[PDB]
Every structure is written in structure tokens, then in C-alpha cells.
Write a sequence for this structure.
């Protein structure tokens, strides 16, 4: 199985994840794909922001769920 990760570009990344694919590990998977250091990686789900330490099983995330990916870059 696999879940979906949508970015501000509209690109939906599909990957395989387990209940130990915690935001910490998940951030690493995306990094190897986009090259964005976990520092610029922000996972949002249900308008709620996720924190490092909780697992997909803890947030009740499914194996097909859709995750919202956001990048940190302020300046205006």
C-alpha cells in the first residue's frame, strides 16, 4: 500500500509507509525525493500541524490518507 503527499505545486507523491514511519522518518523519505532538509519540511493533516515524535499510527493516519506538504520560507 501507500499514502499520498500533496505539495503547494500540486504534485502528489505516493510512497510506502508503516506505523513506524513517524514524521521524523517520513520527513527523511521526502528529503531523498525532493532534497528538502527536514528543516524545510512541514507535514499538515486536517488543518492540524504534525510534530516530530508521533507515528502514523498515533495520528490515526491511514495507508492511503492524503498528507499536505508545506515548505518554510518567509521573507515577503
Amino acid at each position: 500500500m501507500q499514502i499520498f503527499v500533496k505539495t503547494l505545486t500540486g504534485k502528489t507523491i505516493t510512497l510506502e509507509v508503516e506505523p513506524s514511519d513517524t514524521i521524523e522518518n517520513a520527513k527523511a523519505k521526502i528529503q531523498d525525493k525532493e532534497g528538502i532538509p527536514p528543516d524545510q519540511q512541514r507535514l499538515i493533516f486536517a488543518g492540524k500541524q504534525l510534530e516530530d515524535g508521533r507515528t502514523l499510527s498515533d495520528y490515526n493516519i491511514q495507508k492511503e490518507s492524503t498528507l499536505h506538504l508545506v515548505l518554510r520560507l518567509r521573507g515577503g
